[PDB]
Design a binder for this molecule. Structure first.
Ligand SMILES: COC(=O)NC[C@@H](Cc1cnc2ccccc2c1)c1cc(CCCCCc2ccc(NC(=O)[C@H](C3CCCCC3)N3CCC[C@H](N)C3=O)cc2)ccc1F
Ligand SMILES: COC(=O)NC[C@@H](Cc1cnc2ccccc2c1)c1cc(CCCCCc2ccc(NC(=O)[C@H](C3CCCCC3)N3CCC[C@H](N)C3=O)cc2)ccc1F
Ligand SMILES: [Zn+2]
Ligand SMILES: [Zn+2]
Lengths: 956, 959
């Protein structure tokens, strides 16, 4: 009761937000944000400790991360380690945590009815944790699993490298993840007891004065106040001074430096970094966001436009980057063409030229006003968040903003400060520049190796003559400030719900040219709409060449429209356009206001598109590398790719695609585009703040624009063919084996093909997947330690389904095969032995997952789109299937497992894909497995088997 | 020596390549005989040709000679049983047939070589003691009426009788030869005429041995055949009947300079030009009509056709002499018409007269005659061995026109050049002697006459003297020039020695990403010929209706542009076919191997460097549209078979989709399509004949090099070489697809009982059941129940799958045909239960012999090899393997198979029916009990049918 230091004033929110908020500070120093939502399906809480990796002891790298994993392992009130995860498993909840350089954030979600139970378990870890020594080894192996995952990832390698080139005395040079070496091998050699140092670090840094708690639930602000006071007033205050790092990790000796790095994928990137002071205090004016907007701009007269026109880069990322408290960065990152890689000095000269233009022309208030106005719209009409991510995020921002500004934080801009823009800009100079070039052209040309990832690199001082040239940069007439953004929305009217509005999408047009699904939004009432279009053409996937031409076409289309579309994206109007195995997919999402102008520009450009030869050659080269770079993808990704090729009627391989790519000449592409658009079928979904008439008007405008400019005619119904799944023989087992040449981990996908999708077959598979879900993770991952990726669940494709297992392990594929099979028998027992109460808990847990209500329009549109892309159109599926699921018995599941999934099942349809590790050679009792039929040639495999029928669509 | 033999002919001129032995003789009763000894023959044959036909019919019964044809072979005093000859032949792998023309009635049969005497004895009995079973009178009248009812709906038969109806009505040429229900029943009954008594009067008046000719072919020696024929045909009664002669031409002055406007059934635009001529038969050693037909009907540069095509009036032309009867003949010039041609008939005829007058001005050419003589000399020498049945029937006719020694050289050898005779014939080709007939639907409603026998709507007009004058006065036209020396005439007839590494079946001698080459050097016929087959694969030939139309148009324009050059090769026995398929293009080059690489090079170069002429493109595009619409006028059984292929194949474009897409085929789109089609290909070839391994490899490389060079051809990926699958029918399912034929008033049906994928066992289970039911299906459904004119049964094979099919065309509704077929399968189930092991082994043996039956010419062997290649099974030794398995089969194996797959209540029944309704139709009697049939699932949309079903795998290859 007197355990509250203060209660904040009104928590500034959007008028559209019905959730009720209350900010307060407990006597111990804990900053609190309470969120009352009587409608919420799930309740949630989050605690963020303002201590992270940058505070790790130098002798124990990754200790903050280690403590994150250890803290939630038993308490005095709840001594069992399983208690927290078990309680959330039993009440449709989840939990997760993350460690950054200055924060350790713990969070969970649970069924709205069980907030007190869940929060009670959570709070105890912050009162009397036990840090159980039984799980010490397994948590160390978990931390090591995470680091080993990131070792071959080019982004994590670059992330650590930057840290290695700065001041080695600075906490910024620290390795924050940790691994087996830093948490076991080195402490043991050095005579460090990990447990006493863990306990030590905890005692010194885990103080309430550095903690922020966020609670979201059905309960009122008052009941939420009472609960948070009850469970968090006991958090010990040690009055810890919040760590600051005001010295920049890049001093004079770390500047005017050039780095030459070797990547894993065939990627070519340039990274330009300027050390800057911490700009967080100026958040109400945000001069870094201001400069980020201009330097990063993609509209006409932009730095990017000229860099692209010069044929040097394709993409650009610019602006402020976080460091820690006391130090930040201003970055200008570009990818490089083959010509760009030879014109790095020229690229950086253009970057400095652009910076100089902003200096000569000075700050612009109209630009800042535009940013302010866009941010206000974006905040006002922000989509509703899933509570788990909402609490976690707020727990962090509580440490940086007054209680009342916690929601507006990342949005509201106020005073224009030209003084600060001038200040930040004055730091963007050649004397302060850091350059990093990433390219395979440096293989065998480097002398240094980064210890944690093995990254190969060289370091050079940039010559004074180069710095002088960049300092002396002329003024370029190609660079001009962006003009006023005509995509800024103004019409925010929510259209009244029509008399004839429907709960699900309805077919409001069914012609030879198009099938139109429409639903006026009756849930979110934000001034937005989602416009999904599926274009069908037999010429988009007829052969590898055409598949490449479909891809090149849309990539060049997007490239040409970019300068125009960028203003729309800044204004909350975005689109996606990609080729499919059937034609093209187009999606326009955001504010409905200017939506038809963007859409009409896109349909027009599709049909009157004139290709720039220089861009075509550059996009073709980037696509060749992209096809090659798949070799550097994870072995499980490879295993899942090989199974889609094997099981789909028609599927062109990356090898066939890259082989036909050389035959894509410009005259062939120019000929392809009219041929592709000559005959189409359009299937659309228009969902949102729109009427039935407006929907018809949109569809009609897309047809009319194509008919006018491309002379489009409808396709024949007989031409609208969908690919079938390969029908496996009863009691058959096939294996397809390949090698991953990059990763030293194995990849596997095991598919037990069941049958064609139907209400009954769907829920047999979904309930069996629900039953074995937690156990497969506990047995195969927790107990057996097979690998970081242990996945099980239903697999659905082309109207067909089955059960799959996906594993990425150090162990061989044939071994994982016997382990999965061992588990299948272990579950045969576990189902016969479980109680009816336990069985009914699985049915309830599935029904809850299946009825999870979308929190935003996009999530609902995606669910409707799923029904459309599969041609099933079962919009009421969830309700029907849940109702059917509740009528299932334990016997039904036993009958099904016996007929389809058991080792001795009469209708067993097994197909495995084995992806060997880079260096790889070519417990419960595992059952006797037959000799597999090995697949040498995919064409012959496919030819030798029947093809399933295609699922019959659900009709009104 | 023999008193029954009037005279034995001298040496029968034969080909030096022919191993068969020949003997000509005349019996004392006047019968002219040819005996053919062939110890090699699998089937023996005999034919009798009576020099009496339709032209001799009495006025009271039109079609009597033809009715006699049917009645004569129904019982004899020695073999009273009506169906003896039929059953005997059927029991010994034989067959029989007959035809009645205006001057001949020809009866023929074939049988297993071990049963010539048995078959010949029953055959001879019809010319000694016929009975004409009064019980089979009505069924014969119905058979004659069904035959005419089929002809009524045919454009060529209509024109045939209409030509006869526009001559002198008083001349026997105007007679209706077929007969029908009216002439054989309706009319004689209304007049008290005794059909039988009048039939017998005719037979007793005209059937005389001095007007008869007999050919016997067997494994027996010439001497044994001599004794056999003397024994069986010397007792045939001689009534010394005089040979009917027709010296007066049926076309007299009043039938000349006449114009006819005719309405056809199909949307066809044709022009027929005719001139009466004396009978030229007796000039056969010089053949002036052949010489003139060769020049008038020429298609090489300077030809009449070339100029009619350039003017855009016609696409095709046929020209030459046409048989009439003893005493009269016709000279014809027939062309089809473009839309413009139909408007320029007067000009087309002027051009025809210009070419004629040019021949007159140029005068006969000895060198032209020499080429024809030399070509015919090559043709006779290197002639393919004829099928025995057709061979005897042909000679039986020819025996009436030529001395015994010349019956084989008859229609081949040219001796003396007679420029005077050429001149005599050309003198009759003048505008004052012309007859002109235009056939077009543009005349519908614009006519006033009706030819009553067929119902043909026509109009007759005299040709203005004004028009005749223009034709008579036609200016000289320089576009008409005589053909030049035919450089394609073969000279190298060397049979290359059989290579040391020669194989009995084709061998894969080239296996690349671009091409699969199957090759076999001929080791049986040793004739200087070769067959070159190429299947060019492309996913763009059938990707959609448009591309399918473009592949069609492409190859039609290409055959049209190569035609002038190709025609000389065709005359020199070097022919080619080029067609689009559902997988790409098919090319076959057949004939004398000599100049073969030259023609092949020209076809491939032209394919790769094709320059389309806009005028031709529009004409061919217009012809194709009509060809697509003309499918509506095809018979209902043809429609039923087409609909089933649409339904059962993974991908298939309908005639309506093809014609909907045709208007989009522009000249720029077709020009873009060709390099696209040829850009990526796979070539699968079969080269079989008088060629070596080196020569075969050189041919394929030349084809590849030509495509690579001019079309920049690259290979297709093995994953792109996808074949279409058959639809997999559900166990115990019955599906029905129904449509209507808007032209014919007869139903069409195809019933398909899908079994399973082709395999040694499945194939022979189906082929033995098909063997067992084959004859009974005909005798029951066609002969006894009179279901229809068309009754067919046998295995169906498509996309590696098989089943049992029934194809029937009837006047009765499709659902009634369904019950009769179903009752018949019950009769067949009972029949197999009841049949003796003896009768069962006879079925195994009849099938085994049929399957092991050796090909008699190179093309028949290559076709067998091509069948294995196109199906991608490549099982060239199949017959030996399948016959060996078939022989192990028991009666129980077939009952088990019938019970599981075909029975009405079979657990794995897979029935699909196509019902084609008649034009005007809408939807005990001591007969077999039809079973309880379920309600069929009516297919409304073909796409939904295919989507809702699995697709079978494809058969695994042998190689
Ligand atoms: C944090 O991880 C890393 O640091 N990894 C390494 C570094 C490169 C690095 C650098 N010097 C090195 C010297 C030596 C040795 C190694 C080095 C390594 C690296 C950096 C990044 C950058 C990550 C930080 C992202 C923070 C951020 C910064 C700018 C933006 N703007 C925009 O989004 C702007 C936008 C314009 C409107 C106003 C607000 C900003 N933006 C929008 C999208 C497109 C547009 N062109 C644009 O612009 C966004 C995020 C990504 C990969 C990478 F490997
Ligand atoms: C016997 O059948 C018929 O008679 N049917 C009727 C008529 C139409 C008709 C005609 N006048 C009519 C007046 C008034 C009212 C109605 C009429 C109706 C008709 C005739 C035919 C012709 C049938 C007889 C066939 C005899 C024949 C004649 C010439 C040839 N040459 C060639 O094949 C020549 C060949 C060149 C080398 C030397 C030998 C001749 N030939 C080769 C192929 C192509 C080339 N252009 C060529 O040329 C062939 C057969 C075809 C259809 C048709 F409806
Ligand atoms: Zn971790
Ligand atoms: Zn007949």
């Amino acid at each position: 009761n007197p355990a509250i230091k203060r209660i904040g004033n009104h928590i500034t929110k959007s008028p559209e937000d019905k959730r009720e908020y209350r900010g307060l500070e407990l006597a111990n120093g804990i900053k609190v944000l309470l969120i009352s939502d009587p409608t919420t399906d799930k309740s949630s809480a989050a605690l963020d400790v303002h201590i992270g990796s940058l505070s790790d002891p130098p002798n124990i790298a990754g200790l903050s991360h280690f403590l994150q994993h250890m803290l939630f392992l038993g308490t005095k009130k709840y001594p069992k380690e399983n208690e927290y995860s078990q309680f959330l498993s039993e009440h449709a909840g989840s939990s997760n945590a993350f460690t950054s350089g200055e924060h350790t954030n713990y969070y969970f979600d649970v069924s709205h009815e069980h907030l007190e139970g869940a929060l009670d378990r959570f709070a105890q870890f912050f009162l009397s944790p036990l840090f159980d020594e039984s799980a010490k080894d397994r948590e160390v192996n978990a931390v090591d699993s995470e680091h080993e995952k990131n070792v071959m990832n080019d982004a994590w390698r670059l992330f650590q490298l930057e840290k290695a080139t700065g001041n080695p005395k600075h906490p910024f040079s620290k390795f924050g993840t940790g691994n087996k070496y830093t948490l076991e091998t080195r402490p043991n050699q050095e005579g460090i007891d990990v447990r006493q140092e863990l306990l030590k670090f905890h005692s010194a840094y885990y103080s309430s004065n550095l903690m922020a708690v966020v609670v979201l639930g059905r309960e009122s602000l008052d009941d939420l106040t009472n609960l948070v006071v009850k469970l968090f007033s006991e958090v010990e205050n040690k009055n810890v001074p919040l760590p600051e790092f005001p010295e920049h990790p890049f001093q004079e000796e770390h500047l005017k430096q050039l780095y030459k790095i070797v990547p894993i994928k065939d990627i070519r990137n340039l990274y330009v970094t300027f050390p800057i002071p911490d700009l967080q205090k100026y958040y109400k004016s945000n001069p870094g966001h201001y400069l980020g907007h201009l330097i990063g701009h993609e509209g006409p007269g932009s730095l990017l436009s000229e860099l692209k026109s010069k044929g040097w880069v394709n993409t650009l990322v610019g602006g402020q980057k976080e460091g820690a408290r006391g130090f930040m960065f201003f970055i200008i990152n570009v990818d490089l063409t083959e010509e760009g890689l030879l014109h790095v000095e020229d690229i950086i000269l253009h970057m400095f030229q652009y910076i100089q233009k902003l200096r000569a022309e000075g700050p612009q208030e109209w630009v800042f006003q535009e940013l302010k106005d866009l941010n206000a719209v974006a905040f006002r009409f922000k989509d509703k968040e899933r509570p788990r991510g909402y609490t976690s995020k707020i727990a962090g921002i509580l440490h940086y903003y007054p209680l009342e500004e916690v929601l507006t934080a990342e949005y509201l801009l106020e005073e224009f400060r030209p003084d600060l823009i001038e200040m930040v800009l004055d730091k963007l100079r050649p004397e302060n520049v850091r350059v990093a070039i990433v390219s395979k052209s440096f293989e065998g040309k480097t002398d240094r190796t980064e210890e944690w990832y093995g990254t190969q690199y060289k370091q050079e001082a940039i010559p004074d003559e180069v710095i002088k040239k960049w300092q002396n940069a002329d003024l370029n007439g190609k660079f001009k400030l962006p003009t006023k953004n005509e995509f800024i929305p103004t019409n925010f009217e929510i259209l009244p719900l029509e008399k004839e509005a429907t709960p699900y999408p309805a077919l409001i047009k069914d012609t030879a040219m198009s099938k139109l699904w429409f639903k006026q939004d009756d849930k979110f009432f934000l001034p937005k709409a989602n416009l999904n279009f599926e274009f069908f053409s037999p010429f988009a996937y007829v052969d590898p060449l055409h598949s490449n031409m479909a891809y090149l076409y849309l990539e060049l289309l997007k490239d040409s429209l970019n300068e125009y579309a960028y203003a729309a994206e800044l204004a909350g109007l975005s689109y996606d356009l990609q080729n499919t195995i059937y034609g093209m997919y187009l999606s326009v999402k955001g504010y409905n206001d200017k939506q038809p102008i963007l859409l009409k520009k896109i349909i027009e450009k599709m049909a009157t598109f004139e290709i720039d030869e220089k861009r075509f050659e550059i996009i073709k080269e980037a696509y060749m590398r992209s096809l090659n770079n798949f070799r550097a993808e994870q072995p499980h990704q490879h295993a899942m790719y090989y199974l889609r090729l094997l099981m789909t009627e028609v599927a062109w391989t990356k090898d066939e695609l890259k082989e036909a790519l050389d035959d894509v000449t410009l005259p062939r592409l120019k000929a392809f585009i009219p041929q592709l658009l000559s005959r189409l079928h359009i299937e659309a979904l228009l969902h949102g703040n729109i009427t039935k008439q407006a929907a018809l008007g949109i569809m009609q405008m897309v047809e009319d624009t194509l008919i006018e400019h491309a002379h489009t005619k409808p396709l024949l119904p007989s031409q609208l063919v969908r690919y079938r799944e390969v029908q496996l023989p009863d009691r058959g087992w096939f294996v397809y084996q390949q090698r991953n040449e990059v990763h030293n981990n194995s990849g596997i996908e095991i598919y037990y093909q069941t049958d064609m999708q139907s209400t009954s077959e769907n829920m047999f598979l979904e309930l069996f997947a629900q039953i074995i879900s937690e156990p497969a993770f506990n047995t195969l991952r927790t107990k057996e330690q097979l690998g970081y990726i242990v996945f099980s669940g239903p697999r659905r494709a082309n109207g067909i389904q089955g059960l799959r297992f996906i594993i990425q392990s150090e162990k061989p594929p044939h071994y994982l095969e016997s382990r999965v099979e061992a588990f299948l028998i272990t579950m045969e027992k576990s189902i016969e032995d479980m109680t009816e109460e336990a069985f009914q808990k699985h049915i309830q847990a599935l029904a809850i997952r299946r009825l999870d209500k979308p929190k935003k329009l996009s999530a609902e549109s995606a669910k409707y789109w799923g029904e459309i892309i599969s041609q099933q159109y079962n919009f009421d599926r969830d309700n029907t299937e849940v109702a059917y699921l509740k009528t299932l018995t334990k016997e039904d599941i036993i009958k099904f497992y016996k007929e389809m999934l058991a080792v001795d099942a009469p209708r067993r349809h097994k197909v495995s894909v084995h992806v060997l590790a880079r260096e790889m050679d070519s417990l419960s009792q595992a059952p006797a497995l037959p000799q597999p039929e090995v697949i040498q040639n995919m064409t012959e495999f496919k030819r030798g088997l029947p093809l399933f029928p295609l699922v019959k669509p659900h009709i009104n």
